[PDB]
Design a protein around this ligand. Structure first.
Ligand SMILES: Cc1cc2nc3c(=O)[nH]c(=O)nc-3n(C[C@H](O)[C@H](O)[C@H](O)COP(=O)(O)OP(=O)(O)OC[C@H]3O[C@@H](n4cnc5c(N)ncnc54)[C@H](O)[C@@H]3O)c2cc1C
Ligand SMILES: Cc1cc2nc3c(=O)[nH]c(=O)nc-3n(C[C@H](O)[C@H](O)[C@H](O)COP(=O)(O)OP(=O)(O)OC[C@H]3O[C@@H](n4cnc5c(N)ncnc54)[C@H](O)[C@@H]3O)c2cc1C
Ligand SMILES: Cc1cc2nc3c(=O)[nH]c(=O)nc-3n(C[C@H](O)[C@H](O)[C@H](O)COP(=O)(O)OP(=O)(O)OC[C@H]3O[C@@H](n4cnc5c(N)ncnc54)[C@H](O)[C@@H]3O)c2cc1C
Ligand SMILES: Cc1cc2nc3c(=O)[nH]c(=O)nc-3n(C[C@H](O)[C@H](O)[C@H](O)COP(=O)(O)OP(=O)(O)OC[C@H]3O[C@@H](n4cnc5c(N)ncnc54)[C@H](O)[C@@H]3O)c2cc1C
Ligand SMILES: NC(=O)c1ccc[n+]([C@@H]2O[C@H](COP(=O)([O-])OP(=O)(O)OC[C@H]3O[C@@H](n4cnc5c(N)ncnc54)[C@H](OP(=O)(O)O)[C@@H]3O)[C@@H](O)[C@H]2O)c1
Ligand SMILES: [Ca+2]
Ligand SMILES: [Ca+2]
Lengths: 442, 439, 440, 441
C-alpha cells in the first residue's frame, strides 16, 4: 500500500536506518493512510541486507524486555493490523502464544514480528545501503538557504556511492558499540553486538577447551557469559566486572511509569538539571543491570560448581568482580591474548582465546553522519538539539522551513529513558507522521 | 450500527439472555457488518436490569480465570474494536494495565469491559425481561416461534415473533436436595447480593458455614474472613482437600477454539472419557494461589493456637450434610455432618451453598416446542453449528433453535466459558446470517 | 561410631539394601545411641559398589522433589548431626545454599548429602553384595520354630556367595524397572533407570542426528525428553504417550498433607477399600505427572519450533499423544528399530534408541523371601506388614524375637509417602524402637 | 543459665534484650552445653517481656530473612535454639514445611525468639530502662577504671538501681528518626508506634479518617497498605519526596554482603572503601520496598483507576515528590493541616493523623556512655569498635579486665548486616569468645 519513489526524484522524507524506530514510522504512515483507521514520497535506507533486530545478540533463550503490548502499534491503536497479536493471528499462532502465558516473547519471535511488519514496506526500503554523509542542497545555487538534503549511501556489497535527494531526513540509527579506550584492536576482541555473528567464525570448535572472557556486568554481559557455558561446554569462562556484583534491573510498576508514552511531554518540559537528576535516579531500570531471573540462573550454575569443588579458583566458569583491564598483549601468532587485571578500586593475568566486550553503546553517531550539515545549526551549538517533536534546531537564515532533520533513539537526555527503547515507538511513530506529514495529509 | 427492530415484526433472530455468549454474537454480527473488517432483524432479551457478569460473586480481589487475549473478539479478529485492549485504550487505561503485568484482569474490570461492549447494542437489547415460554408458530408446519417474556418490574407478558431462536441462559444454581427453604441458606451465586442484607453488622461474631470445595467455595470462605473479621467460618467439603486447578499448557489446549471441531467429531464414549479426564481444569478445583493463601491463613491460626478445634476459621474435610435443621428465624440453623466415606453439629447464622450449577434450564424453557424434536428424543441434540435437531416434517427450513453454553457434552469444556466466544460468535453469525449477508 | 559386627556372628538386625530407607534407620540408631540427643549387632548389604541415589537418572538440572526439611533426620530431631543443614555447615556451604532461596536441592546435591551420611556408617555396610535369598533358621534341633534367618548374598565382583545369620531382617530394596510386557529385549531399548549410565555407551556421538523415542508421560519421561534435546542437540526426539497430554503434579499444600509423617497412623487404620480409594484420589501428587515448571519449559521449546516452522510434522522434537506401541521391529544389522504406533483410544518411527520411562514395581521382596513365605499365616499370598512394618508371622512357627520388616514397598497399607523420602526420618525412629526398643 | 544477685560484680551486663543480646545468651548457652562443645551474666531490657518491633507487627508482615539466618543455625545447626527446632518443639515443623516459604510471618519469628528468650528468664530483668554507664574503681585511690556501674530505671516504679560489672554490651537497636521541622503532637506518630498508638487515637475502625503516611521505605509501604484494611473507609495519602517506591534488592550476588564471613572482608577495607561499599548496597534495605508489596499497592491503585480515571478523586492516593513545609496543629479542631511543596530543588491535606515512617537513628549508645567517654584514647570523639566489637579505651586509664562492646550500631565498620538478624548466630559466637574466652578455657 506504500509505493516506491524513484531513486532520483526529490523525496519528502528519507529515514536513515530501518530498525524498530523507523519501522514504527512506516507503520504509523501506513495507518494514517488507512481509511479503515482514519502518498508522501518516502524511503528508508538500512545498512544490513535484510531487517534484523540486534542479530549479534540473538542468543538462545533471550527474551524481549518489553511487554508485547508495547509493540509497534498497539499503544497508538490496538486495531492496527501491525499489532503483535494480529501478526500472531496472521501466522496462525495466536492461541498458541496465549497458552504460553508470557508478556515477554523470545527475541527471535519479536524479531520475526518486526520482520513481518517490515516485509510490507519492502518497496520503500533500500537494504545494504550505509548512509555515510548528508550534504546541503539548494534548488537555486545562488540561494542563501538550504532547501533539501542529498543523502549519500555506500553499497555494503560493492562500495558504490548512491545519492538521494530529500526535503526531510530522519536519523534512527540506534547505537554504536562503546569500547573501553584502552583495549587494542584485534580480531579476538569482540563487542557484544557481534557475539552471535562473529565469535562462531573465530572459535569454530564448539567442544574445544577455549578460555573466553566477558567484560561487563549488564544484560549483554550476563546473557553472553551464561550462553557461552552452553555454546562451548568445555570452555573456561571468566566474567570480569568493575562493580562488586551483577545487579538486578528495576521492573517495579511505579518506577517503570517513566516509560509510559504520555510521560514524554512532562520529562521534556523539565529543566536540563532536573532531567539530568531524573535520568540518574532511574538509570537502574535498564543500564548496568540484569533481569533478576537471569542473575539467579547464573548464581545457581555457580552454586553447582561449588557443590563439586569448594575452591572457587578451580571452577570452570568464574566471576572476577571489582577488576579492570589495564593491558592486553595480543601480538604474535599465538592463539591466546594475555589480559592484565587490576582492582577497580580508586596484578592478575588471564590467557584468553577471545574477549567479549559487553560494555554497551553510544548514541552519538548522528553527529558524524551530519557533519557536512552542522554549519546549519544555530551558533553556539556543538550538538544537534531536538525539539519536543524531535526536529533539530536549524538557523532559519540558513535552512528553508520546508526542509528539516529529525532524530530518533538518541534523545534520552531531552525525552527520557524510553527514547532508545521499544517502549514509546507506536505513539512516537504517530507523532512523527503528524509532525513530518500533517500538513501534506490534510 | 445495529438498529432496533420494532417489537411486533417477525425477527430473524432472537437471543434469550445477554451474557457473554449472546454478547459475542452481537459483536461478531457488528464486525461482519463493519467495512474495516471485511441489516438482520435481531433482538436480545435479558432478565437482569443491565449487563452483569455473575454480580453475586464479585468478591473483592476476584480475578477472571482467562487470559485477556480470550476476550470477546481478539481470537476471531485482533483488529476488532471490541477487543479488551481497545477497550482499555478507549478508557485511557491501556498503559496502566500494561504496567500491571497480568493476563488475568479483576472480574470487576472484565465485567466492565463486557459492559462497555454491551452498551453498544443497547438499541437491540431489552433488559429486565425474563423469557418464560417459546411457543410454536405457523398448514401443519411450524415456521416461526413466539418468545414470551415477563417484565421483572411490572410482570407484564410480552410476545416477540422470530424465525430463529438462540438460547444463551448460562446455568442455574445447583442445590443439594433435601435442604429446607430458609433465606439464610444462600447459593454462592447470590453471595454478594443476599448475605450482606442478611448479616448487616460486619463486626458481629456470626457463625457462617460454606459448603463445597471448588473456586466459588474457596473465594467465599476466604472473603468471609475479611468481610466479617470476628466471624467463625467453617468450610464443609466431602473431598479431603481443596485441589488445584490445572493451568498447565498442554492440558489447557482443550480450550483452544479449533479443538471444538476435534472434540465434536468424537464418539459419545470418547467425549465422556475426555471430559472426565480433564475435569480438573475447572470443576471442583481452586486456583493454586488461592489455596496457598487460605492455607497460610490457617497456618497463622495454628501459630496462635495449636488446637485446631478452637480456631476461629476451620475446614471440615471428608464430611457431608445429612440435614440442615431450623426452628425459625428466632434461632440459628443446625447443620448435621457425617463422614463422606462410603460426625459434627454446627450452629450457624447462614449457610453458603457453593455447589455449582446446572445447565439444563433450556429444556423447561423449550418444553412447549419439544414436540417438534424427532420422535424418541428426550433431550435437545445440537449439531456442530449449535442448531438443535428438529423433526423436518414439522419445522420449516427457515426456522430453527440454537443453544449456547449448555453443550459441554457435544462441544467440550470450553462451551460454558469465555474461552471460545469470539470464534464461536463468528461461527454463529455465519450459520445464522451467512446467506442473508451474502445477498 | 557404629561399630562393625564380625560377619560370622548372629546379628541383631540385617538390612537388605543401603538406600535412603535403610540409611535413615542407620541414622536413627546412631541418634538413639547418642546421649547428647537421647550397641546392637547391625549390618547392611548393598548391591551397588557405593551409595548412589538413582544415579541412572542424575540428569543435568534435575532437582529433588521434597523440601530439604524432609531430609533423613530433621523431622525426627532438628538437632541431629545428619540434617541437610548440618551437612551443608560441615561442607562450608550453608550460607551459600541459603542464598539460593530454594527448598529443592539439585538431585546431585541431595545425593551427595546422603552419601556424606552414608560414609559415616562404612563400618557396618558391605557394598557390592546382592542379597539373593532369606532362608529360615531353627537353632533348636528339637523345636520346629524358626528363631533366626540366614541372608545369602552374591558378591557382585566375584560372584561368591556369603551367608550372614540374623534374628531380624529389614528389606529396603526400593523398586524394579517396570517394562511394558509387549516390548522385546534389545540394547537399544533402555529403561529410564539406566538413562545416564547406559544410553551414552550406546549412542556415543553427541552430535549425530539420532532418532530417539521416549515412552511415557510422567516425571522420568519429561526429564529424559527435555534432557535428550540438550545432550544430542541434532537428534530428532519423539515423546510417545498414551495420554492426551503431560499433566502437572499436585504440590498444593492441603493435598500434600497426605505426605505428613503423622498421617501414616490414620492411613493405616483405614479399610482396604478406603485405602485403595484414597491412593487413587491422590495418585496425581506424584504418579504419571510432571512438575509444572518442567512442563512449561518443554512447552516453550515446542512453541519455539512453531515460530520457526508452523508445520509440526516437520519439527526436530515432537510429542505424539494418545499413542501406544503395538510392535517394534528390531532384528537385523540395521542401526534403527521400527516402532509401530496405534491410537490408545479403546504410523511408524525409525529410531536408534527407545527410552522407556514406564515407572517401577515394588514387588521384589516377594522373590527374596520365597523360602520363608511358608511362615506367613494361612491364606495370605502377600506379606502383610503391621503398622510398625513388621510382617505377620504365624506365631506357632516363628519365635517372638525373630522377624522381618519391609521398607518402601508398603504404599497400599501405609500411604503414598511410603516409597519416598517424605517420612524416612520419623520412620527410622519408629523402626529403631520396633526393632531395638526392648534391647535399648 | 542461673541468676546472679543484683548487687554482685558481674562478668557481663548486656543493655537490651532484643535479637542481638538474645543471640549472645544463646551462644553462651551453647558454649556451655557439652553436646555442642557459670559466668555471672545479666541482661537489662526496657520492655516488660521480649518483643520484636511490636509497634510494626501489622497483619501479614513477613520477616525479611530466610529462617536459616535464625539466632543459631549459621553457627551450629545442631543447636536447640534453631528455628526448625523451635517448630519441632511447638509440634509445627511439618506444617511450616508445607508452607514452602523461607520468610515466616513477623508474628511467628517474634514467637520463635520469645521462645528462645524464655529460657533465659533467670538472667533477664525486664522493665528496666538503662540510663547511664558510670566508671568504677575497685581501689578508689588508684588511677585505673576496672569495672562499670550500670544504672537502670524500673519502668513500673521509676526507682533507680545499680548493677556493677566488668564488661558491658550495648545492644539497644535504634531510635525513631523524625524530620526536625515536624512539631510534637499526639496525631503525629512514628511508624514504630503504629500498632500500639494509632488505634488508641483513632478508635472507630469505620470512621472516614484522613490519614497521611510520610516516607517511602518498607515501613511507610506496610502502614499505607495496612491502613486501607484497618480503616476501610479512611482516605489515606502516602507522601514521599522520591518520585516512586523502589524495590529492595534481593538478588543473590549482591545479598552476599549479608554473609557472616563477609564481616572480616568489610571491616578490613579502608574507611573510604567502606563508605563507598555501603552507599553502593543501600538498595538492599534502605528506602526500598519488597517488590511484592509494591505490586500489591500498585494493583490496589489500579482498581481505583478502573472505578474512576481521575486520581484526585481516589480514596487512597500517593503524592510523590512532595515535602512537608508546615504543619498547623493548634486549636480544638480534630484535623491538622499539612502544607506540601515540591521536593524538587501550594497544596494542603487535612488529616486526623500523620504516620511518620522516616526510619531510625543508631546513636543512643553515645548518650548512655557519656559518663565514660573520657576513657577513650586522646583525640577520639566517637567510640571506635574493633573487629570483635570492643570499643577502644585508653589503656593507661582502663584495666584490661574491663571493657565495653557495641552491637547493632556498627554499620560503618562492620557492614549493612550489623543491625539486622543476618549475622546474629555467628556474631553471638564471636562475642562469647571475646568476652568469656579465657574464663571458659
Ligand atoms: C542486544 C541489545 C542491546 C541493546 N542496547 C541498548 C542501549 O545501549 N541503550 C538502550 O536504551 N537501548 C538498547 N536496547 C534496546 C533497543 O534499543 C531497542 O530494542 C531497539 O533496537 C531500538 O530501535 P532503533 O530502531 O532506535 O535502533 P536499532 O534497533 O538499532 O536500529 C537502528 C538501525 O539503523 C541501522 N543503521 C545504523 N547506522 C546506519 C547507517 N549509517 N546507514 C544506514 N543504516 C544504519 C542499523 O543497521 C539498524 O538496523 C538494546 C536491545 C538489545 C536487544
Ligand atoms: C462466579 C462464576 C461462576 C461460574 N460457574 C460456572 C459453572 O458452574 N460452569 C461453567 O462451565 N462455567 C461457569 N463460569 C464461567 C461462566 O460460565 C462464564 O464466565 C460466562 O458467564 C458464560 O457466559 P454465558 O453468556 O454462556 O452465561 P451467563 O454469563 O450466565 O449469561 C447468561 C444470561 O442469561 C440470562 N438469563 C438466564 N435465564 C433467562 C431467561 N429465562 N430470560 C432472559 N434472560 C435469562 C442471565 O441473566 C444471564 O445474563 C462461572 C464464572 C463465574 C465468574
Ligand atoms: C529418578 C527417580 C525415580 C523414582 N521412581 C519412583 C517410583 O517409580 N515409584 C515410587 O513410589 N518412588 C520413586 N522414586 C522416589 C524414591 O523411591 C525415593 O527417592 C528413595 O530413593 C527411596 O529410598 P529406598 O531406600 O526405599 O529405595 P532406593 O533409593 O531405591 O534404595 C534401594 C536400595 O537397595 C538396593 N538393592 C536393591 N536390591 C538389592 C538386593 N537384592 N540386595 C542388596 N541391595 C539391593 C539398591 O541398590 C538401592 O541402593 C524415584 C526417585 C527418583 C529420584
Ligand atoms: C519494623 C522494623 C523496623 C526496622 N528498622 C530498622 C532500621 O531503621 N535500620 C536498621 O538497620 N534495622 C532495622 N530493622 C531490622 C532490625 O534491626 C532487626 O530485625 C533486629 O531488631 C535487631 O535486633 P537488635 O536487638 O540489634 O535491636 P532491637 O530488636 O531493637 O533490640 C534492642 C532492645 O534494646 C531495648 N532497649 C533500648 N534501649 C534500652 C535501654 N536504655 N535500657 C534497656 N533496654 C533498652 C529495646 O527495648 C529492645 O528490646 C527493622 C526491623 C523491623 C521489623
Ligand atoms: N473468579 C472466577 O472466575 C470464578 C469464581 C467461581 C467459579 N468459577 C468457575 O465456575 C465454575 C464452577 O465453579 P464452582 O466452585 O461454582 O462449582 P463447582 O466447580 O461445580 O464445585 C462445586 C462444589 O460443590 C460440591 N458439591 C456439589 N454438590 C454437593 C452436594 N450435594 N453435597 C456436598 N457438596 C457438593 C462439589 O463437591 P465434589 O468436589 O465432591 O464434587 C464441589 O466441591 C468453575 O469452573 C470455576 O473455575 C470462576
Ligand atoms: Ca513489572
Ligand atoms: Ca507447596
Amino acid at each position: 500500500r506504500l509505493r516506491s519513489t524513484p531513486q532520483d526524484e526529490l523525496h519528502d522524507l528519507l529515514c536513515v536506518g530501518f530498525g524498530p524506530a523507523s519501522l514504527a514510522i512506516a507503520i504509523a504512515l501506513h495507518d494514517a493512510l488507512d481509511p479503515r483507521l482514519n502518498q508522501p514520497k518516502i524511503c528508508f535506507l538500512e545498512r544490513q541486507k535484510q531487517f534484523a533486530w540486534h542479530s549479534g545478540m540473538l542468543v538462545p533463550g533471550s527474551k524481549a524486555q518489553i511487554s508485547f503490548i508495547k509493540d509497534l502499534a498497539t499503544l497508538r491503536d490496538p486495531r492496527s493490523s501491525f499489532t503483535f497479536l494480529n501478526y500472531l493471528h496472521q501466522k496462525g499462532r495466536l492461541i498458541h502464544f496465549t497458552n504460553l502465558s508470557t508478556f515477554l516473547p523470545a527475541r527471535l519471535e519479536f524479531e520475526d514480528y518486526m520482520r513481518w511488519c517490515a516485509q510490507q514496506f519492502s518497496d520503500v526500503v533500500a537494504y545494504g545501503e550505509e548512509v555515510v554523509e548528508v550534504i546541503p542542497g539548494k534548488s537555486d545555487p545562488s540561494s542563501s538557504v538550504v532547501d533539501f538534503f542529498t543523502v549519500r549511501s555506500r553499497n555494503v556489497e560493492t562500495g558504490e556511492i548512491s545519492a538521494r535527494r530529500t526535503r526531510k531526513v530522519v536519523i534512527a540509527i540506534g547505537g554504536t558499540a562503546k569500547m573501553p579506550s584502552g583495549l587494542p584492536q584485534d580480531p579476538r576482541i569482540i563487542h557484544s553486538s557481534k557475539y552471535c555473528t562473529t565469535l562462531p567464525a573465530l572459535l569454530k570448535d564448539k567442544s574445544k577447551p577455549y578460555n573466553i572472557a566477558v567484560l561487563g556486568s549488564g544484560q549483554s554481559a550476563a546473557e553472553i557469559f551464561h550462553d557461552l557455558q552452553k555454546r562451548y561446554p568445555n570452555s573456561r569462562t571468566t566474567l570480569i566486572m568493575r562493580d562488586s556484583a551483577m545487579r538486578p534491573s528495576d521492573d517495579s510498576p511505579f518506577v517503570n511509569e517513566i516509560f509510559n508514552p504520555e510521560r514524554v511531554d512532562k520529562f521534556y518540559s523539565q529543566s536540563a538539571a532536573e532531567r539530568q537528576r531524573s535520568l540518574l535516579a532511574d538509570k537502574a531500570t535498564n543500564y548496568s543491570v540484569v533481569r533478576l531471573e537471569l542473575i539467579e540462573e547464573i548464581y545457581n550454575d555457580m552454586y553447582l560448581q561449588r557443590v563439586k569443588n569448594p575452591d572457587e579458583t578451580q571452577w570452570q566458569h568464574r566471576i572476577l568482580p571489582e577488576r579492570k583491564i589495564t593491558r592486553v598483549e595480543h601480538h604474535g601468532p599465538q592463539s591466546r591474548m594475555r589480559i592484565h587485571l587490576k582492582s577497580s578500586k580508586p596484578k592478575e593475568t588471564l590467557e584468553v582465546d577471545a574477549l567479549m566486550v559487553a560494555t554497551g553503546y553510544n548514541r552519538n553517531a548522528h553527529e558524524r553522519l551530519l557533519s557536512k550539515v552542522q554549519h546549519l545549526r544555530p551558533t553556539g551549538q556543538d550538538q544537534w538539539k531536538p525539539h519536543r517533536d524531535y526536529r533539530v534546531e536549524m538557523d532559519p537564515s540558513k535552512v528553508s522551513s520546508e526542509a528539516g532533520i529529525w532524530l530518533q533513539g538518541c534523545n534520552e537526555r531531552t525525552h527520557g529513558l524510553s527514547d532508545s527503547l521499544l517502549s514509546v515507538l507506536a505513539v512516537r511513530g504517530g507523532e512523527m507522521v503528524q509532525s513530518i506529514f500533517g500538513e501534506q495529509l490534510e
